[PDB]
From a paper:
Ionotropic glutamate receptors (iGluRs) mediate the majority of fast excitatory neurotransmission at the chemical synapses in the central nervous system (CNS). AMPA, KA, and NMDA receptors form tetrameric cation conductive channels that are activated by presynaptically released glutamate resulting in an influx of sodium and calcium ions leading to membrane depolarization. KA receptors are abundantly expressed in hippocampus and cerebellum; display characteristic slow kinetics, are mainly involved in long-term memory formation and motor control. They are divided into two families consisting of the “low-affinity” glutamate binding subunits (GluK1-[name]) that form functional homomeric ion channels and “high-affinity” subunits (GluK4 and GluK5) that form functional receptors only on assembly with “low-affinity” subunits. In order to understand the conformational changes underlying [name] functions in the context of full-length tetrameric receptors and to explore the role of N-glycans in modulating their functions, we expressed and purified rat [name] receptors from baculovirus-infected HEK293 GnTI− cells; trapped them in agonist and antagonist bound states and determined their structures via single particle cryo-electron microscopy.
To understand the structural basis of the receptor rearrangements during its gating cycle, we elucidated the GluK3EM structure in the desensitized and resting/closed state using single particle cryo-EM. These states were captured in the presence of agonist 2S, 4R-4-methyl glutamate (SYM)26 and antagonist UBP310 respectively. Further, the resolution of our EM maps is adequate to show unambiguously that in both desensitized and closed state the ion channel adopts a closed pore configuration, where the M3 helices are arranged in a crossed bundle assembly with the pre-M1 helices wrapped around the channel. In the desensitized state, the LBD-TM linker strain due to bound agonist is relaxed via rearrangements of LBD from a dimer of dimer scheme to a pseudo-4 fold symmetric arrangement, where the LBD dimers are disrupted. Consistent with a 4-fold symmetric arrangement of LBDs in the desensitized state, LBD-helix E separation in both distal A/C and proximal B/D subunit pairs is equal at ~21 Å. In [name] desensitized EM map, we observed residual density at the ATD-LBD dimer interface, which was not satisfied by the fitting of the ATD and LBD co-ordinates. Interestingly, the residual densities are in close proximity to potential N-linked glycosylation sites. In particular, the density near Asn 247 in ATD and Asn 402 in LBD appear more prominent in distal subunits as compared to proximal subunits. Hence, the presence of this residual density at positions corresponding to N-glycan likely indicates protein-glycan interactions. It is interesting to note that N-glycans at Asn 247 and Asn 402 are suitably placed to mediate inter-domain interactions between ATD and LBD.
Author numbering:
A (entry chain A): 153 to 203
B (entry chain B): 3 to 272, 285 to 385, 402 to 405
C (entry chain A): 52 to 102
D (entry chain D): 204 to 253
The structure:
Amino acid sequence: GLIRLQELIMAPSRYNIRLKIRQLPIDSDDSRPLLKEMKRGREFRIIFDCS
Amino acid sequence: HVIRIGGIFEYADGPNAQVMNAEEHAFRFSANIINRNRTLLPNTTLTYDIQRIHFHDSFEATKKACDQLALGVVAIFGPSQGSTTNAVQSICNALEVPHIQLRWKHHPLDNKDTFYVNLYPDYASLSHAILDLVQSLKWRSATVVYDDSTGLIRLQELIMAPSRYNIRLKIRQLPIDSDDSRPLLKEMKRGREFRIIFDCSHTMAAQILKQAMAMGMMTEYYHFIFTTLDLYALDLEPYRYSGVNLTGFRILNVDNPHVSAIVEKWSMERDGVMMTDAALLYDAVHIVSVTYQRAPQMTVNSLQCHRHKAWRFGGRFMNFIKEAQWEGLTGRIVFNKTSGLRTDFDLDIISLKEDGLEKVGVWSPADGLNINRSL
Amino acid sequence: IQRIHFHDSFEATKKACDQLALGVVAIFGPSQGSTTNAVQSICNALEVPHI
Amino acid sequence: HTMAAQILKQAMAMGMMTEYYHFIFTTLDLYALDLEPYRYSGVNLTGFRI
């Protein structure tokens, strides 16, 4: 995904935007620890590309 | 009793190219001086083979490997391109052959393959050593500057590191379109930048030296981070007297007098410092040498590509390989046996004086840095 | 049409040499890019395009 | 001019080619060896012309 969107990673040259970065651990699919981490972030404007 | 390995190198005009690299130089050099080292193998003779191919082709080295197995070679080291080492690893694992590797390539756990190792350092351990560095710098603002698109994957650990250790960050690429990033450097001086990390080629590192020298961006207000070990080609007497805080890395035991003497004899033989890639070559030769020495007698055979002939003790000698314990030029060499791949390795931390460059710290994946009376 | 497994360059390399010995004009490769790098190599080597 | 080139070499070598440094250059043969490496440092600077 990095090489899929590194310009979108390097986007904030043209705009005042900050961002978190979250790889899904592909080891399994129970993201509920990572979901509670997102809950600690409690964020609302997030990009998603996966299967 | 004679044994023979092979080797495949990419060049400009392939077999019709002319100049040997220093890797072929060190290849013949190391192999012939360890044949001279009569500590190695009294009755057994180690010979070798060198193939020249072009850059960026799998099929060239495919034919070369089919030639080497039509001969039947006792060991095989790996090529440069990922597209090569794809098919190399495929036919190696398919035909009970080990694939010795040197560079980083992408490695899927989904591609459950076995018969290979790599001499390349695990980037997660590298990035975590850098994390140890910058938390020792106690920084809360930084900027990512990088040469090629590959280092983003190779540094995505450090990219995630602002999560558990909050730090401001800007992310920009060194443009490969020309030999110039000076207007970006003008942006960086306007970017108010003092905390910048650098991974690139030694050639691009020399471009950095030249430009940041010429930009007026050699300031003592700068404390900058450098990944590759290849400062030894590069002069620093135009640089080390400007007061710029700076940090290089090392994995090699230069501080071994023995290894330094190996470099000393190497220095007469084409600044005049033995390549890290040549050190990797020497270590790969010596680990395969030790794993061959540990084993009893086996069946050196010739097998064919279009058929399905696989050499029976290939798994046995793979068990010899992946479970080896060797103290190399870089020092301790040990694998993640879940992967069979070297992920454990120490990092010498070095930095500069007006005197010159000097070792300032160590690193490990386990731990890391270590520097009667009356009232 | 050749049914192959995942994640093997040499498998589709053999089958690519098979469809070359056949002689094919539209080249409909695998999912694994690391597999089909050699396919593109032999396509560009033997004067034939690649899809 | 030779020792002036020595000045440029040493303040180059010491990294004292700074924008916080403002230069009073006097003799007429300033141009002699190349000044363009010293150009893009970004200093304040002054010369003379006759």
